[PDB]
C-alpha cells in the first residue's frame, strides 16, 4: 500500500528530474557574456525623513509616486509627502505590535496588521476631517505577515499558520483559502494582471497559485534555509528570491528551472529584501551588514553599494515612474536615494 | 516664492510634530517584562497573586509601573517572533522542579534561550515552583534521583539534609549552564518560591534595580 505509493512518487520525481535535465540546453552566463557591461554606478542621498521614535517594519509607495506610508512600533502610522517633506496624517493604533502596512491603488483606504491577529482597514476620505476605522477582519489562528490589495473590495492575507486567505471587505468572510505549506510563510508577491500570485515559506520552497481556481500550479525548491523576501519580474516570467544562506536566486516559470545564482565569498549575513527597476538591468538587495548592494541582472557582477545606516535594513521600494528609490532601517530614519 | 497654501501646510505640519514629542514622555516611563515557560507550571497562579491573542498585565509597586507580556502558540517554534522583543528589561522564566522526568526538557529550553543570537543583552530571572511538593515527594522515599542523574549519588554537599542537598543540586545544575560563556554581558538570578508566596514583587523590584544599576555604571565607564 504505502510502499507502492512511495515507489510511484519516486518514479514521478525521477521522471520530472530527467525531463528537467533533458530540457537544459546551455548556461545563461555564456549567452549573456556578449552584452557590454553597464559599468560603475554611483548614487547619492537627496532627502532624509525623520520623526519616528522606534524601529520601522514596513513601507509602501503611492501610485502617483509622491506619497507614502510608514509604520513603526511606537503605535503610530504616518502618511508622508515626498517633495515638500510635510506630514498629512498621523494615526494612533490599538495594538503596539505591527509588522506590515498596505496602500490602496485608488487612494482611499489603508491596511494594517500584526501580532493581534486582526487586519484593520482605515478610511481617509471622510467628512469632519478625521480618520476612522472602517473595518476589522478576524479569523486567523496565527499572526499576520503580509497583505496586498486586489481592488477596492478585495484583499489577500498571509499568516504564520501555513495558510493564506482571500477576503471580501463587504461580506467579511474568507471566500477562498489556500493550503499546502509545511512551514510558516513569510512573503507574498502579486502579478501585474492580478491573475496569479506567488508565495514563499520557511521550508525553502516557493509556490504558484491561481486566484480563480485556488490550486497550486507549480512548486519550486532549491534553497537550504528560510526565504525572507520575494520579487517579481516586470515581464511576468521570472522570480528573484533571497534567503538566510546569503545567496540570491533567479527562477523561471515556463522552463520550470533555475537560471542564475547571485553570491560572493566575502559576505555571510542574511538577506532581508529585494527589488528590481523599470528596465530590468538592476537588482537591489539589502543585507544585515549595515548596507545595500546592486547587482547586474545578466552578467552577475557587483556594481555599486549604498551605505549610511547604523542598523540593519528592513524594507525598500522603487516607484512606478522609476525616478527614485527609498530605504528604511532600525535607525528611525527614512532615506530617499536618486 | 511660496504661496499661502504652503504656509498653511507647514503650520499644520508643525502642529502635528508637537504632539508626538509631547506624547512620547508619557510612554517612556513604565517598565516592561516578558514571561516565558512551559505548561504544567503556575504562570496563571503567580499572575493572579501579583495582580491581587496576546495577553498583557499591568501593576503598580512603590509608584513604579510594570507591564508583563506573554505569547502562547506556535508549537514551541518561536524563532521568528522573538526578534520583536529586543528591548525588554528582563525575561521571567519559570519551571517546576517537582517532576523528575521532564527536567531535561527544561535544561534544553534554557540552553536554547540563553544562546540566542538576538538575545545577547537581555537578562533572565529564574523561578522554581512547587517546593513543598518536592519536599513531600522526597520524604515519601519511593522517588529516586540517582536513576535519572547518576552523578547525584557521588555529589558532596558544600529540616532534612536530603531536601536541602537536592535543592542545591538542582540550583547548581541550572546555574552551571549560564556561566559557561556568559562573557560578563548578562547574568542570572536563582530563586526558590512556593505556591502561597506573597513577596515576589520585592524580588522583582530589587533585581530590576540591580540590572539598571549595572547597565548605567557600564555606560558611564567606571570599570
Amino acid at each position, epitope marked *: 500500500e504505502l510502499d507502492q505509493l512511495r515507489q510511484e512518487a519516486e518514479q514521478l520525481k525521477n521522471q520530472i528530474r530527467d525531463a528537467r535535465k533533458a530540457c537544459a540546453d546551455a548556461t545563461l552566463s555564456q549567452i549573456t557574456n556578449n552584452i557590454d557591461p553597464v559599468g560603475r554606478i554611483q548614487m547619492r542621498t537627496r532627502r532624509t525623513l525623520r520623526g519616528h521614535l522606534a524601529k520601522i517594519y514596513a513601507m509602501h509607495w503611492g501610485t502617483d509616486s509622491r*506619497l507614502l506610508v510608514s509604520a513603526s512600533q511606537d503605535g503610530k502610522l504616518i502618511i508622508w*509627502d515626498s517633495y515638500t517633506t*510635510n506630514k*498629512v496624517h498621523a494615526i494612533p493604533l490599538r495594538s503596539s505590535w505591527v509588522m506590515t502596512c498596505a496602500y490602496a491603488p485608488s487612494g482611499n483606504y489603508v491596511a494594517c496588521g500584526g501580532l493581534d491577529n486582526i487586519c484593520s482597514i482605515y478610511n481617509l476620505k471622510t*467628512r*469632519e*476631517g*478625521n480618520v476612522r476605522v472602517s473595518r476589522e477582519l478576524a479569523g486567523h489562528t496565527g499572526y499576520l505577515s503580509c497583505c496586498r490589495f486586489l481592488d477596492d473590495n478585495q484583499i489577500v492575507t498571509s499568516s504564520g499558520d501555513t495558510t493564506c486567505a482571500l477576503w471580501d471587505i463587504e461580506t467579511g468572510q474568507q471566500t477562498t483559502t489556500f493550503t499546502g505549506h509545511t512551514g510558516d510563510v513569510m512573503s507574498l508577491s502579486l502579478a501585474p494582471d492580478t491573475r496569479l500570485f506567488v508565495s514563499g515559506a520557511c521550508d525553502a520552497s516557493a509556490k504558484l497559485w491561481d486566484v480563480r481556481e485556488g490550486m497550486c500550479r507549480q512548486t519550486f525548491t532549491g534553497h537550504e534555509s528560510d526565504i525572507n523576501a520575494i520579487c517579481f519580474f516586470p515581464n511576468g516570467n521570472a522570480f528573484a528570491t533571497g534567503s538566510d544562506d546569503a545567496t540570491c536566486r533567479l527562477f523561471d516559470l515556463r522552463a520550470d528551472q533555475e537560471l542564475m545564482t547571485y553570491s560572493h565569498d566575502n559576505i555571510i549575513c542574511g538577506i532581508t529584501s529585494v527589488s528590481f527597476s523599470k528596465s530590468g538591468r538592476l537588482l537591489l538587495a539589502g543585507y544585515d551588514d549595515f548596507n545595500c548592494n546592486v547587482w547586474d541582472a545578466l552578467k552577475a557582477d557587483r556594481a555599486g553599494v549604498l551605505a549610511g545606516h547604523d542598523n540593519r535594513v528592513s524594507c525598500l521600494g522603487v516607484t512606478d515612474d522609476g525616478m527614485a528609490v527609498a530605504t528604511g532601517s532600525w535607525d528611525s530614519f527614512l532615506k530617499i536615494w536618486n | 516664492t511660496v*504661496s*499661502a*497654501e*504652503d504656509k*498653511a*501646510a507647514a*503650520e*499644520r505640519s508643525k*502642529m502635528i510634530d508637537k504632539n508626538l514629542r509631547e506624547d512620547g514622555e508619557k510612554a517612556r516611563r513604565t517598565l516592561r517584562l516578558l514571561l516565558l515557560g512551559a505548561d504544567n507550571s503556575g504562570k496563571s497562579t503567580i499572575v493572579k497573586q501579583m495582580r491581587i491573542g496576546i495577553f498583557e498585565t499591568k501593576f503598580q509597586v512603590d509608584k513604579v509601573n510594570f507591564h508583563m507580556f506573554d505569547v502562547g502558540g506556535q508549537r514551541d517554534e518561536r524563532r521568528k517572533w522573538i526578534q520583536c522583543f529586543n528591548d525588554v528589561t528582563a525575561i521571567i522564566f519559570v519551571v517546576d522542579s517537582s517532576d523528575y522526568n521532564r527536567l531535561q526538557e527544561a535544561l534544553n529550553d534554557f540552553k536554547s534561550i540563553w544562546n540566542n543570537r538576538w538575545l545577547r543583552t537581555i537578562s533572565v530571572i529564574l523561578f522554581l515552583n512547587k517546593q513543598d511538593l518536592l519536599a513531600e515527594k522526597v520524604l515519601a522515599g519511593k522517588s529516586k534521583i540517582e536513576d535519572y542523574f547518576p552523578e547525584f549519588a557521588r555529589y558532596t554537599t558544600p529540616e532534612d539534609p536530603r531536601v536541602t542537598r537536592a535543592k542545591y543540586f538542582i540550583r547548581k545544575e541550572f546555574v552551571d549552564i549560564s556561566t559557561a560563556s556568559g562573557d560578563g554581558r548578562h547574568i542570572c538570578y536563582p530563586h526558590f518560591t512556593c505556591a502561597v508566596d506573597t513577596e515576589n514583587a520585592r524580588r522583582i523590584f530589587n533585581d530590576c534595580k540591580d540590572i539598571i544599576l549595572q547597565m548605567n555604571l557600564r555606560e558611564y565607564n567606571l570599570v
Partner: single-chain antibody, 222 residues
Framework: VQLVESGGGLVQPGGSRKLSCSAS????????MHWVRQAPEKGLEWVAY????????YYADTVKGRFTISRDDPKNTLFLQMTSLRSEDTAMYYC??????????????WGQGTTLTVSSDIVMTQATSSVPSVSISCRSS???????????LYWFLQRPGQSPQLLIY???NLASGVPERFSGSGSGTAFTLTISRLDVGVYYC?????????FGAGTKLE
C-alpha cells in the same frame, strides 16, 4: 454639520455690537474660519480670517483697527467685536470653514447669515453684467499661475434664497455632489466656465493667490 449664527442688532452710529456663531457635528480645532460680508445692493467682500490654533490673524485693509475676532474651542464658538459703528457698515455676515493640505478642498461649507441695519491688489473682470450650451468668461489683471504648477481660481454659485456653494476649484476638479455637466478651463489671464445640457443664478470669480481676497463682479443667468 451645522453652523448657526444668532446675534447682533440695530444700534445707533458710534455704538458697538457683538456677533457670535456656534458649530456642531465636526471637529473645530482642525479647520480655519473666515468672516465675509455682503452689502444689500452690492457683491461679496472678504472681512477677516483666523487660522487653526489662533496662530495667525488677518484683517481687511479698509476696516483694520475697528474690529476684533476670536474663538473658544472648548465651547466651540466663534465671535467678533465691532467698534465705531457707521452708516456704511450695514451688511449681511457669513462665516465659512476651510482646511489646507495636499489635495484639500477649502471653502467647503457656508452658514446662514444675520442681517444688520445701521441707523496694489488684483482686480477681476467679468464678461458682462448679465447674460440670459453656455460659456462664461473671466479675466484678471495678472496671471494666476505659480512655478509649483498650481493655478488658483474658484467658481461660486449663488441661488435665490439659499447660501452660496462651491462648484470648481483649480478649474479642473469637481466638488462633491456636482453633476458632470459642469466644466472649466483656461490659461494665463483667461478663464472659462462651460455648462451643457441645461440652475440659474449668479456666478462669481475668486482670487486666492494673495492675502487680500477679491470677489467677482457678478454675472447672472436668466
Amino acid at each position: 454639520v451645522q453652523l448657526v449664527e444668532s446675534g447682533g442688532g440695530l444700534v445707533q452710529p458710534g455704538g458697538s455690537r457683538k456677533l457670535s456663531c456656534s458649530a456642531s457635528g465636526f471637529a473645530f480645532s482642525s479647520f480655519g474660519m473666515h468672516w465675509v460680508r455682503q452689502a444689500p445692493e452690492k457683491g461679496l467682500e472678504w472681512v477677516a480670517y483666523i487660522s487653526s490654533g489662533s496662530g495667525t490673524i488677518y484683517y481687511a485693509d479698509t476696516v483694520k483697527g475697528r474690529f476684533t475676532i476670536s474663538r473658544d474651542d472648548p465651547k466651540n464658538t466663534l465671535f467678533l467685536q465691532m467698534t465705531s459703528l457707521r452708516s456704511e457698515d450695514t451688511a449681511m455676515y457669513y462665516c465659512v470653514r476651510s482646511i489646507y493640505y495636499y489635495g484639500s478642498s477649502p471653502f467647503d461649507f457656508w452658514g446662514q447669515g444675520t442681517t444688520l441695519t445701521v441707523s496694489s491688489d488684483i482686480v477681476m473682470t467679468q464678461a458682462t453684467s448679465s447674460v440670459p450650451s453656455v460659456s462664461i468668461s473671466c479675466r484678471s489683471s495678472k496671471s494666476l499661475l505659480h512655478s509649483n504648477g498650481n493655478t488658483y481660481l474658484y467658481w461660486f454659485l449663488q441661488r435665490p434664497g439659499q447660501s452660496p456653494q462651491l462648484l470648481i476649484y483649480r478649474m479642473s476638479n469637481l466638488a462633491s455632489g456636482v453633476p458632470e455637466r459642469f466644466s472649466g478651463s483656461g490659461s494665463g489671464t483667461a478663464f472659462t466656465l462651460t455648462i451643457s445640457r441645461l440652475d440659474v443664478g449668479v456666478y462669481y470669480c475668486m482670487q486666492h493667490l494673495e492675502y487680500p481676497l477679491t470677489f467677482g463682479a457678478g454675472t447672472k443667468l436668466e
